[PDB]
């Protein structure tokens, strides 16, 4: 209703575009509710370019005690950039939120495209999934060369740009290892995209990201994770049991090469898990699946994507159907919170 009107106004702005503070960006509809607060489209008045602005609400920060997570995402993304990691352009704060302003990816997220491709036939066909898996691998590799364990990766954090190329994004649940450790404990990541090691609270290396890659590849093709059914996701406790105990099932929609590849990544034990064993990430690349992919051209962005997003119809989420989390029930900020808020802004 109004939500279509808001979407239409965004489209109207996009059309014009194709052809700090809140007094520096004209604000449009939300595009999702991220890990911390809203992520809405916005536009610079000084150059007429569209950006997504991940706002981290002060209220929501206090409730979840999400102060660590905020600082991590900032420092990592600010320093680390590639062709498969989104650029960070600005870090300021506003009245009621801390802002990270990053480059547009107005092509929608992979999770959206799983069901949008066809409502009654969700999931991609084989070439399209294979292509995206190869691009995700390059992004993961870039993190691993900098000695960063992401501890997460899921379709909704894999964004498509206008062309149709995919990129990983959000490094807020990551940890950068120092030289002196190779494994570390934690519980970082979103359930079902967390590896066995993470769930058991054990130490783990780079391996967990390759487990997540497996979950992603499976989900693109079958329209469900390895550890849950179609259009259903079980509770965190049950999901934790699924990841630890259940052996992956497959239809024959998968090619033998893709099946075998997916199994290798979804292997439970880091030693037998394909990926970075501190040798090469190009050992993974030797799998027969990638005989249909040219890696040199992929890395140079010269391969034509299988799906090309429309530049008029936006595939970002509708406003009122994005996520949400409670704002405070009267809870007034600590001195510590205020000090973090000033510090965050740059």
């Amino acid at each position, epitope marked *: 209703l109004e939500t279509v009107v808001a979407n239409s106004a965004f489209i109207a702005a996009r059309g014009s575009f194709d052809a700090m503070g809140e007094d520096w960006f004209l604000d449009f509809r939300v595009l999702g509710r991220g890990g911390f607060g809203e992520v809405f489209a916005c536009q610079m008045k000084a150059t007429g370019k569209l950006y997504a602005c991940k706002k981290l609400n002060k209220k929501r920060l206090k409730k979840r005690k999400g102060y660590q997570g905020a600082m991590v995402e900032k420092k990592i993304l600010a320093k680390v950039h590639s062709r498969f990691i989104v650029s960070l352009a600005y870090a300021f704060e506003t009245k009621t939120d801390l802002c990270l302003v990053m480059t547009i990816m107005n092509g929608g997220d992979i999770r959206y495209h799983i069901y949008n491709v066809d409502e009654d036939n969700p999931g991609f066909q084989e070439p399209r999934a294979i292509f995206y898996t190869a691009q995700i691998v390059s992004g993961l590799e870039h993190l691993h060369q900098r000695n960063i364990i992401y501890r997460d990766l899921k379709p909704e954090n894999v964004l498509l740009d206008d062309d149709g190329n995919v990129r990983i994004s959000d490094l807020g649940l990551a940890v950068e290892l120092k030289a002196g450790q190779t494994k570390t404990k934690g519980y970082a990541g979103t359930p079902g995209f967390m590896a066995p090691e993470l769930l058991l609270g054990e130490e783990y290396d780079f391996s967990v990201d390759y487990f997540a890659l497996g979950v992603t590849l499976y989900e693109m093709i079958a329209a469900r994770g390895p550890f849950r059914a179609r259009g259903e996701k079980v509770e965190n406790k049950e999901l934790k049991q699924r990841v630890l105990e259940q052996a992956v099932t497959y239809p024959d929609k998968f*090619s*033998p090469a893709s099946k075998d590849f997916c199994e290798a990544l979804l292997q439970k034990d880091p030693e037998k898990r394909l990926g970075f064993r501190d040798g090469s990430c190009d050992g993974l690349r030797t799998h027969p699946l990638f005989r*249909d992919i040219s890696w040199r051209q992929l890395e140079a962005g010269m391969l034509t994507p299988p799906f090309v997003p429309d530049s008029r119809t936006v595939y970002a989420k509708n406003i009122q159907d994005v996520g949400a989390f409670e704002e405070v029930k009267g809870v007034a900020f600590e001195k510590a919170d205020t000090e973090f808020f000033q510090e965050f802004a740059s």
Partner: antibody
Amino acid sequence: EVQLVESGGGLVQPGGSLRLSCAASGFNFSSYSIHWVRQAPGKGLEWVAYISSYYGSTYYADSVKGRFTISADTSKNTAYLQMNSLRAEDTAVYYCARHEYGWWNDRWGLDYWGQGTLVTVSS
Amino acid sequence: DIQMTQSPSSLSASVGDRVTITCRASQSVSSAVAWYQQKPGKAPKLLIYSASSLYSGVPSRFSGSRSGTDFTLTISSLQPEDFATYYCQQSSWYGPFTFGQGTKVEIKR
């Protein structure tokens, strides 16, 4: 290629053992499947069972079940079918199929067939 | 498996006729059908793979068309050397392989 010459010929008694063995060469067996195709004399083409290198999936036809035990070698590309139960319908001018592996998820027909050497089951 | 049903059972046509034979698979196998020419005491020659794509080193009078469950092989102009039994086949890269019952092409007089 065309060079898929049986070197497992000769008469073998019913219920006997003779290892039919493909003299496969002119390609490398790991992008192909050397599943045994039998042109029974004056009768139509049939399938026996799947053969794979790395993939290691093997599946019988629903009429040769456990009468043959498939085996494979990638050091000479020979594919050996063990004989261990035979009837008289296991008389054919055996050929070695060669079947492409996909270039996305592509299934083709059988590019080449052997030159055969007759195998008979008779008493 | 997936049954392959050939039609017609036999046909009799003269040289220089356009002959189309049909093959129906019981279950859809996508584009994954082949066609063979078998002449007695010879190795089978592959004519068509992928339901409609010509095999290299096969004459261009053979063509195939169609997908779904109903597959076709067409001989544009019949020859006196097209006396043969023609077999359709379904292929699968994770399933069985099954052949037809043959279509007998007879040279008419």
